């Protein structure tokens, strides 16, 4: 007990991606949902080997009634083959764990957080996987980790299904599934920088390596230089169920932080015969994580700029603004090759705004609210995955810690 941990989160999420050109038959992807999530992580039994258990429990509700059925699926709620939402969905993940010195083994339901396998947090509930995770912290400053998983339960699903890939913008021959995925590597923490390397195989689909670093380095007493750089290398393997895969992808975001301001510039580029592959049900793993597209197409070059302010030291009269944060960012992607268009190339851009407030003290401490807006355009054909849209996400969350 004594080192157990538990939290209960209540979430209200409205999602509206309002398509500019109403690609028949939908005017928007939209849903309004509420969710409860319980996350419990026990400590370990005493013994040379210690044992414990972790649990994740999720209950979600539709707040739009049958009205929801006239819109394209958001991902907040399960949607049936006639487009009707399920009005309620519930699901439980359990994990058994064992520890020997600073080595831990986890078997069951998992929420991976690696560049080769990163559970999507971007809808109501987390994506989860079923398998085995091993983590060693025996080496100071280095965390070694691996996953072997064979099923995935998507954020908007109550069922485990086979691991695999989605087909974004017809990037590959098809979306495919398979029976296993494994990844292993490590993360090394320096004073001001973290360095990471991982290898992954999605059986008969692709192999992928990652190298990356991120840091926050003081240039003097008041100015910090922030960096996050990610490199992927991907190739097809085995029976090559999605066909050729041939990609290198580099992305970086570089920022200056001064007196609670941050200004950053971002760059991405894809190289190779294809775009970037990654697991189904989740966002691209590259540095720029925008609302309305993955920005990860074959040959796409991406330029971005970002501004943020943390209002920790700001006030409006007697009202402290601590717990307010503002961000805005713009990205443009060009030289997009959709493969089936000869020498034609495509382009896309996004202007986003993000305002979040978390109550810092008092009775309502822990209550958070966020509003995000994206104006997204592209000149891509109508059979592609992402369409010009004005996208709004509104969140109100409250977490109780036990
Ligand atoms: C390899 C697959 O093994 C894990 C299957 O897990 C099911 C949930 O298990 C909870 C175990 O306590
Ligand atoms: C209720 C206010 C919501 C405001 C949202 C828009 C914010 C645009 O924000 C940037 C705000 O920061 C301006 C303050 O300038 C201070 C000067 O430099 C040092 C301050 O730490
Ligand atoms: C090496 O990756 C960066 C450069 O790739 C150039 C395009 O190569 C095409 C063959 O995959
Ligand atoms: C000369 C730079 C002009 C560009 C203006 C953009 C400003 C967006 O950042 C707002 C920062 O408020 C800063 C407080 O000092
Ligand atoms: C839409 C334009 C891009 C963002 C520009 C922001 C430029 C500065 O705007 C400041 C607006 O005010 C925010 C409210 O600030 C309250 C207190 O800040 C106190 C700083 O000590
Ligand atoms: C939509 C993205 C908007 C990008 C903002 C450009 C920021 C230019 O910043 C210069 C000043 O920044 C504040 C420095 O604090 C003093
Ligand atoms: Ca519309
Ligand atoms: Ca159903
Ligand atoms: Ca319904
Ligand atoms: Ca090849």
TrEMBL record:
Gene3D superfamilies: Porin. GO terms for cellular component: membrane. One of its GO terms (molecular function) is porin activity. The keyword Signal applies. Ca(2+) 4 binds at residues 236, 244. Pfam families: OprD. Keywords: Calcium, Metal-binding, Signal, Transport. Ca(2+) 3 binds at residues 85, 87. Ca(2+) 2 binds at residues 80, 86. The keyword Transport applies. Ca(2+) 1 binds at residues 18-19, 22, 27. InterPro entries: OM_porin_bac (IPR005318), Porin_dom_sf (IPR023614). Belongs to the outer membrane porin (Opr) (TC 1.B.25) family. This is Porin. It comes from Acinetobacter baumannii.
